[PDB]
UniProtKB/Swiss-Prot annotation:
Topology of the protein relative to the lipid bilayer: Lipid-anchor
Transmembrane segments: none
Assigned GO CC terms: ciliary basal body; cytoplasm; cytosol; endoplasmic reticulum membrane; glutamatergic synapse; Golgi apparatus; Golgi membrane; GTPase complex
Name of the molecule in the record: GTPase HRas
Role played: Involved in the activation of Ras protein signal transduction. Ras proteins bind GDP/GTP and possess intrinsic GTPase activity.
Keyword Secreted: no
Gene: HRAS
Stated consequence of mutating residue 59 to T: Loss of GTPase activity and creation of an autophosphorylation site
Regulation (activators, inhibitors): Alternates between an inactive form bound to GDP and an active form bound to GTP. Activated by a guanine nucleotide-exchange factor (GEF) and inactivated by a GTPase-activating protein (GAP).
Length: 168
C-alpha cells in the first residue's frame, strides 16, 4: 500500500474544502468552515496501485501552524487551487507556487493546477490562460467542480501520478 502526502493550497474561498470533501465523502459541501484546517485520509487504487492519500486541507492566512509547516515541508505534492470566476485567486497562484518552492527549496516539486468551479458561467479566467500558466510551470492543469464532482478524481489522481513520476 502506498502512502502519498498531499497539500491542498490556494486563496481562501476557491474550493479546497469542497474539493477535498468530495473526494473523501462524495458530497458537495458549501458551508464548510473557512478556518478549519484539517487533514483527511482516503484509500484508493490508482493505476493498479493501492494508495493511502493523506490530505492537508489548508486554511488560515498569516497565522502559522505546526501541521501546515510539517505537511508543507513533508508533503509530496501540492494541489494548487484557484477559482475560475475569481481573478485574484488565479493571480495568487504564483505566490503559492513561490511559497511551496521556498519551503521545499526546490523547483521541481510535484503539483497540479486546479481551476475550480468550472460549473459556474460567471467565468472570469480563460481555460486558455490557465492552461498556459500550467504550461509555463511544467505542470498539469485540471478543471474541477466540487459541486458537480467533475474532474475531482482526475485532479487528485493526476497529482498522485506526478508524485509517482517525480519519484522515478
Ligand atoms: N459552484 C460551485 N461552488 C463551489 C465549488 N467549490 C466550492 N464552492 C463554494 O465556494 C465556497 C468556498 O468553498 P470552500 O471549499 O469552503 O472554500 P475554501 O475551503 O476556503 O477553499 C463555498 O460557498 C462553496 O459552496 C464549486 O466547485 N462550484
Ligand atoms: Mg476551507
Amino acid at each position: 500500500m502506498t502512502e502519498y502526502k498531499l497539500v491542498v493550497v490556494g486563496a481562501g474561498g476557491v474550493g479546497k474544502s469542497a474539493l477535498t470533501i468530495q473526494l473523501i465523502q462524495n458530497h458537495f459541501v458549501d458551508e464548510y468552515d473557512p478556518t478549519i484546517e484539517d487533514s483527511y485520509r482516503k484509500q484508493v487504487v490508482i493505476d493498479g496501485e493501492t494508495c493511502l492519500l493523506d490530505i492537508l486541507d489548508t486554511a488560515g492566512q498569516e497565522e502559522y501552524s505546526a501541521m501546515r509547516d510539517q505537511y508543507m515541508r513533508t508533503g509530496e505534492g501540492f494541489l494548487c487551487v484557484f477559482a475560475i470566476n475569481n481573478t485574484k485567486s488565479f493571480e495568487d497562484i504564483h505566490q503559492y507556487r513561490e511559497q511551496i518552492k521556498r519551503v521545499k527549496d526546490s523547483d521541481d516539486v510535484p503539483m497540479v493546477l486546479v481551476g475550480n468551479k468550472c460549473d459556474l458561467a460567471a467565468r472570469t479566467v480563460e481555460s486558455r490562460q490557465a492552461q498556459d500558466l500550467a504550461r509555463s510551470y511544467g505542470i498539469p492543469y485540471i478543471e474541477t467542480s466540487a459541486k458537480t464532482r467533475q474532474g475531482v478524481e482526475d485532479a487528485f489522481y493526476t497529482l498522485v501520478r506526478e508524485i509517482r513520476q517525480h519519484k522515478l
